[PDB]
A and B are shown apart, each in its own frame.
Chain A
Amino acid sequence: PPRPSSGELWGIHLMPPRILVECLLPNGMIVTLECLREATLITIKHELFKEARKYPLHQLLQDESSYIFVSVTQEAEREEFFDETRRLCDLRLFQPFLKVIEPVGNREEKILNREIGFAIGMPVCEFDMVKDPEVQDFRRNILNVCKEAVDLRDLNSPHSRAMYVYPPNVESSPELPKHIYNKLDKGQIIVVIWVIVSPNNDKQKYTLKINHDCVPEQVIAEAIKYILKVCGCDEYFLEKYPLSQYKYIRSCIMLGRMPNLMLMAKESLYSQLPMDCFTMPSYSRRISTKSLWVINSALRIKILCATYVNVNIRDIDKIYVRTGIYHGGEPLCDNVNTQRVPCSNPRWNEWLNYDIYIPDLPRAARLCLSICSVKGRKGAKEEHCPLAWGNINLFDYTDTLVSGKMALNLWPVPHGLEDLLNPIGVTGSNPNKETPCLELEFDWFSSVVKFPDMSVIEEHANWSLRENDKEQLKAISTRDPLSEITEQEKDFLWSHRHYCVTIPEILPKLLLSVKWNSRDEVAQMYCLVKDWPPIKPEQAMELLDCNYPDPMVRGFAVRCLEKYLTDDKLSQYLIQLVQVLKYEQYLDNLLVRFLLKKALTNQRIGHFFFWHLKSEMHNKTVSQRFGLLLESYCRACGMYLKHLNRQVEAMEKLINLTDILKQEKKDETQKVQMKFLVEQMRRPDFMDALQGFLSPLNPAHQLGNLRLEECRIMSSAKRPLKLNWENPDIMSELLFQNNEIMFKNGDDLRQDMLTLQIIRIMENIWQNQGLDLRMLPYGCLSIGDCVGLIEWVRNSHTIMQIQCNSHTLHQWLKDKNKGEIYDAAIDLFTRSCAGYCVATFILGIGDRHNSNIMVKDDGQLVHIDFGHFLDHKKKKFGYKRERVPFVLTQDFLIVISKGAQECTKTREFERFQEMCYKAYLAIRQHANLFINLFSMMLGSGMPELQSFDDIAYIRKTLALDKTEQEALEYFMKQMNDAHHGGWTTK
């Protein structure tokens, strides 16, 4: 299993400088040896075989070079240490002992599976033990995606392998927004190119003014078989995109900063490219029926018994099993309960009869059941509390309907969940067999009952306009994915399902009108989506949420993404695309294959693909799914696996270091903790691990050597760590020479990670619509259970730090930005207030104050610690009001108006309001995108984002059920009531 802690031994966070180690020689002798914690195995093996001569049977010991060490790791795995250059403290040993053995088996295959197990956080050999056929089938059949990826990766010379390691970070369209094109003069952009001299690596500045349309090769030819690069990081212009389309240049345009680029010979880059060689594993080496429609009968399931439930008899009266047939989130028929049995005797053997025709069960039909406690002590109202839940796929991954008896281990109820069933939950049995077990029995049809083929489907399918009517169809498609859909409108779409092909965007609403309880309508719908014109990616994603489980539906969605999803947007929406993998019924589906294919063909994608999956390997509901996906990715991601392990080992030592500060040394003063921390960070093992590796926040950033002076334990509760590095890039003076990150161990940063993703998406919508609401969405990444990284914005201070008067905030900006640069700082502070003021209101971010808000010398506004969002305060205090979290105070209004009194009556505040109205409407125009993004996060596990009724909060802050004229009047009313007058309409 995964590691309990991150210490060097079980129950110990740090080995002493010297420690005793029991060495089991191959002759049965046991030799106790004292080793330095930082000692390497090749050394220990030497001293051990020097000491062995002092013991009996020393004659039959072979040469020391003929042996290696093995031991039990903290993961209960018996690991062979083929890399004798590793330190004793870096072995993750359970106890301090080493066995001496002669290596056997495929040495190379063992070394890879150990490297893969390290990145996964779990021994790969555990997957070999899985008897579940679907698991092994996934491990073998997924390899074809791997091979096809590694083939395309090396289809050409180094160039192809280069596009994989350093893909072009380009926008999704080269069209330049009108407000971005204005920054260019006569459609030209001045750029400076530096070239390291062949002798002595000197810098050759070569300022030049060139068109933004010109391809990198065109600017290269200027110079008055080569590649360009950004000074400070590792992103390369390896494709013939318009220079404006590349993100670095496009940002520099709006930011007014002059692009600084470095020219390379393209031979030093091609030579560093390794050989991404993929090798087939061991599980790939070694390895009457009746249709469902023929079965004529009703659905029934016998709930046999359960083992136990944890509830005192003195409080709860009775218990029962609540079951229900579900197709996604909606029931295919009324839920069927069993009889109420006492808590101490979980027995029913009651065949539950469901009102559904067996032949009409859709492909994605599932059974959702749970053991509920009934407590009818408080009047006519009897409270029902869920105790444990569990879900099953009526059809396994092989189209085979279930039959016979079955045992199922149930899961605990997720915090905050109040429903009696959890259909959004993952299917399958709980691996923790120390949990309640529910015995079921599906009837058996004297043969393997299977689902009819696509051919039979189309056979049963073929067996079966006013302009104002055309307008009603058009408006239904424009509505958001969460607007009410009356029955009259369901039949309206179903009756015109063939005309809908002209308006492809209506397909989501159309699928909601389908009577999935009817084989007749289902079959016909399969034929419409088969030949349905592809829809836009942002709309296809809606098909992947918990509402659209049918495979054919999801398959169509996948083919839209494969065809029209850019590598930019895929990286933009990767969080949700990873989350939706939990909703899939089976391990092997088209979605997972598409994502894995993209992860193996783009390293900027695979990096975050890896960390998103790794960050939830602690979650036993998806650990097996993500474990098998990670195994397949690492087995084929090539040489980047070496760099990922460098990242994993660095995080493991930061987790261990912070674990000691908040456990063993929690009651010692900060003067003592810093003494301990600096003393530990100076050891060889700690410097070799935390120096020279890629930044998980951005693999383009190289984290070099530590700046221990800038490192410091923050004087806070969670005891976070602020770390500083050196940027090893030769041109480190351009981008940055210090890369600072905050390592947090204790606070769940998932909600904060999602909030920063939506803010980026919001800023993207604004820039495309000529609205430079300059937002600073710094990087945030969750890498484990309440462990994550956050990018440290340099030169920022909290509004409370600035005040240590109403004009205090404005006089501070007058300094550090005095003179001709004054109008720039004000313009940034205002443009950031607009984006933040609109983004916080739309989402419902936790209240802001002088501590959550920060200002940079730049005048840039930086909100921090968002935390809650949506209707999180409605459960605490039953208030049905939409809150204005970020209320511009007098201090903030003085800054926007350049210090003018009567701040509400200034041209600057007029333009400020314009940005808010334009940004609020802009987002309101894209409300379909944001409602789908949250919809794809319902099975994530965030307490403030569980049911579609939690997402309805943003349906109100955007006034979606009102007209665009009424919504802007609602926003004004909300802002005017929270700011105490001032917001006017022009």
Chain B
Amino acid sequence: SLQDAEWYWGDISREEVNEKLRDTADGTFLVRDASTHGDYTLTLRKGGNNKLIKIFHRDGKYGFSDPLTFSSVVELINHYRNESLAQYNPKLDVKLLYPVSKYQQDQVVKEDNIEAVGKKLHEYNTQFQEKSREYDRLYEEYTRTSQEIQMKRTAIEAFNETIKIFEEQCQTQERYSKEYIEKFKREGNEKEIQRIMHNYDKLKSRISEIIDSRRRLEEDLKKQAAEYREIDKRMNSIKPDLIQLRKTRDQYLMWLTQKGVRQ
């Protein structure tokens, strides 16, 4: 027929086609009006790309090349739905096999009266904003958590390097100590051996304290590392639901404008 076939989508934009053809198998096709009348543009999927094949028009005949043979766009689409495009241009060796039908546009409509559609559109629009606020909120905790984890990790890097310094201090003190505690052992200077020992205890204590500060920070890191993974999960669960929720909202809106008076 005329403007009744399913692959004719009238005045859809290239973006509407790219989404209708995104991640589609080679051969998926559809036709729309000229972006720049009544000129037409067949859109075909080939090698993960969206190829635009203009449908020229001269004195009641349609075709891709100069010898416009076909007398109707329906006759052109149906022919190449069974014949390969390579006969026209060898570079495109595929056929119109997967038609994008208006079935998807009329899908999800559900209701038939403007009020029901509008009342239902208002329900979906409410749930969408409520899941967007929920998502945007969850995203900030996601970003905040990710940053504070990077900080804690760098801090633990600092704790290690610091502990290495204080441990170097110990082995340093052990080397000089013997050469002098043995000299006091014979020089009867017992109280000077106690002063050296006391400073060593002061140093071992700090090391034992600094290690516990790293232990508590490492414990906090485990707590935050998991809290990040739970946030990531909740986000990878809200993203797929939020998407189609937005699409369903847009469709109800598309249904409302078409059924309503247009300019």
CB distance from A150 to the nearest CB of B (A): 35
A459 within 8 A of B: no
> B53 and A330: CB pair below 8 A?
no
B169 touches A24 (CB 8 A): yes
Complex CA distance for A432 and B261, rounded to whole angstroms: 55
Our pick among B47, B177, B203 for the contact of A332 (Cβ within 8 Å) is: B47
Task: Give the residue of A60, A75, A333 whose beta carbon is less than 8 angstroms from that of B154.
Answer: A75
Q: Which residues of A contact B111 (CB under 8 A)?
A: none
**A5:B236 contact, CB within 8 angstroms:** no
A74 CA to B157 CA, complexed, in Å: 9
A949, B15: Cβ atoms closer than 8 Å: yes
A545 → chain B closest CB, angstroms: 18
Q: Quick check: which of A92-100, A195-203, A499-507 contacts chain B, the rest being far away?
A: A92-100
Is the Cβ of B243 less than 8 Å from the Cβ of A383?
yes
Known interface pairs A1-B154, A384-B240; A28-B177 also in contact (CB < 8 Å):
yes
CB of A310 within 8 A of CB of B233, answer: yes
Which A residue's beta carbon lies closest to that of B65? A488
Candidates B14, B159, B174, B236; contact of A28 at CB < 8 Å: B174
Q: Is the CB of B165 within 8 A of A385?
A: no
A373 touches B240 (CB 8 A): yes
- Indicate if B41 sits at the interface (CB-CB under 8 A): yes
Range for the number of chain B residues in contact with chain A: 35 or more
- Name the residue on B nearest A326 (C-beta): B48
Alpha-carbon gap, A335 to B192, bound state (A): 78
Query: Does A491 reach chain B (CB closer than 8 Å)?
Result: yes
Q: Which of A281-289, A479-487, A862-870, A882-890 contacts B (4 or more CB under 8 A)?
A: A479-487
Q: Which of A24, A55, A419, A875 has most B Cβ within 10 Å?
A: A24
Q: Are B244 and A381 in contact (CB under 8 A)?
A: yes
Is A56 a contact of B162 with CB atoms below 8 Å? no
Nearest A residue (CB) for B244: A383
B172 near A28 with CB under 8 A, answer: yes
Complex Cα distance, B175 from A663, in Å, reads 47
Contact A491/B162 with A27-B176, A57-B176, A383-B243 known, Cβ cut-off 8 Å: no
1/0 per residue, CB under 8 A from B, across A818-839: the answer is 0000000000000000000000
Known A-B contacts A373-B236, A385-B239, A484-B14; the reply to A10 vs B158 at CB < 8 A is: yes
The range of chain A's interface size is 35 or more
Partner among B15, B54, B151, B160 whose Cβ is within 8 Å of the Cβ of A488: B54
Mark contacts of A1-31 with chain B using CB atoms, 8 A cut-off: 1 yes-contact digit, 0 otherwise. Answer: 1111100001000000000001010111110
Q: In the complex, are the beta carbons of A387 and B236 less than 8 A apart? A: yes
Q: Contacts of A330 on B, CB cut-off 8 Å?
A: 48-49
User: Is A515 engaged at the interface, CB distance under 8 Å to the other chain?
Assistant: yes
A312 to B161, CA, bound (A): 38
Instruction: Give the docked Cα–Cα distance between A3 and B47 (Å).
Output: 46
A412-B158 Cα distance, complex, nearest whole Å: 26
Contact A97 B162, beta carbon cutoff 8 Å = yes
Interface string of A381-397 (1 = CB under 8 A from B): 10111010000000000
Do B196 and A487 touch across chains, with their CB atoms under 8 A apart?
no
A491's partner among B91, B199, B203 (CB-CB below 8 A) is: B91
Tell me the nearest residue of chain A to B184, going by C-beta. A56
Proximity bits, A470-495, B CB within 8 Å = 1, else 0 = 00000000000000111110010000
Inter-subunit contact A28/B170 (CB<8 Å): yes
A5 vs B237: C-alpha distance when bound (angstroms): 32
Q: How far is the CB of A459 from chain B (nearest CB, A)?
A: 24
Q: Is B259 an interface residue (CB 8 A)?
A: no
Given contacts A330-B49, A383-B241, A415-B139, is CB(A99)–CB(B165) below 8 Å? yes
Are B48's CB and A333's CB within 8 A? yes
Chain B residues whose C-beta falls within 8 Å of the C-beta of A131 in the assembled complex: none
State A896–B175 Cα separation when bound (angstroms).
87
In A80-131, which residues have CB < 8 Å from any B CB? 94-95, 97, 99
Neighbouring B residues of A384 by C-beta, 8 Å? 23, 240
* B48 touches which of A56, A73, A331, A434 (Cβ 8 Å): A331
B154 touches A76 (CB 8 A): yes
Provide the B172-185 mask, 1 if CB < 8 A to any CB of A, else 0.
11111100100000
Interface assignment of A134: CB less than 8 Å from any CB of chain B: no
Quick one: given A28-B176, A434-B225, are A72 and B162 in contact (CB under 8 Å)? yes
Contact A487 B52 (CB under 8 A): yes
- Complex Cα distance, B232 from A572, in Å, reads 40
A418 is an interface residue with CB less than 8 A from chain B: yes
Query: Contacts A28-B172, A76-B157, A331-B47 given: A95-B23 contact, CB under 8 Å?
Result: no
What residue in chain B is nearest A416 (Cβ atoms)? B139
Tell me the minimal C-beta distance from B139 to chain A in angstroms: 6
Could you tell me the distance between the alpha carbons of A254 and B15 in the complex, rounded to whole angstroms? Answer: 44
Asked whether A133 is an interface residue with its Cβ less than 8 Å from the other chain, the reply is no
Q: Is A902 an interface residue (CB 8 A)?
A: no
Encoded as 1 (CB less than 8 Å from any B CB) or 0, chain A from 320 to 340 comes to 000010000011111100000
Decide yes or no whether A375 CB sits under 8 A from chain B.
yes
A311 at the interface (CB under 8 A from B): yes
Q: How distant is the Cα of A29 from the Cα of B200 in the complex, in angstroms?
A: 8
Complex contacts, B49 vs chain A, CB 8 Å: 330-331
Contact across chains for B236 and A72 when beta carbons are under 8 A apart: no
Name the B residues within 8 Å of A295 (CB-CB): none
Contacts of A387 in B (CB 8 A): 236
B162 contact set on A, CB distance < 8 A: 72, 94-95, 97
Q: Judging by beta carbons under 8 Å apart, are A27 and B53 in contact?
A: no
Q: Does residue B89 face the partner (Cβ distance < 8 Å to A)?
A: yes
> In the bound complex, how far is the Cα of B153 from the Cα of A878, in angstroms?
42
Q: How far is the CB of A457 from chain B (nearest CB, A)?
A: 21
Q: Which one of B36, B89, B176 contacts A487 once the chains associate, using CB atoms below 8 Å?
A: B89
Can you list 17 A-B contacts (CB < 8 A)?
Answer: A2-B154, A28-B177, A29-B173, A56-B192, A56-B199, A73-B158, A78-B165, A95-B162, A97-B162, A311-B237, A316-B240, A383-B240, A383-B244, A434-B225, A487-B53, A487-B89, A949-B18
With contacts A24-B166, A60-B176, A76-B157 known, what are 18 further pairs, Cβ within 8 A? A28-B169, A28-B174, A73-B158, A76-B161, A97-B165, A316-B237, A330-B49, A334-B47, A335-B48, A373-B240, A375-B240, A383-B243, A383-B244, A434-B225, A486-B54, A487-B91, A876-B132, A952-B14
Residues on A lying within 8 angstroms of B by beta carbon are 1-5, 10, 22, 24, 26-30, 55-57, 60, 72-78, 94-95, 97, 99, 310-312, 315-316, 324, 330-335, 355, 373, 375, 378, 381, 383-385, 387, 412, 415, 418-420, 434, 484-488, 491, 515, 517, 875-878, 949, 952, 961
Give the top 4 A-B pairs by smallest Cβ distance, nearest first. Answer: A28-B173, A331-B48, A310-B232, A4-B151
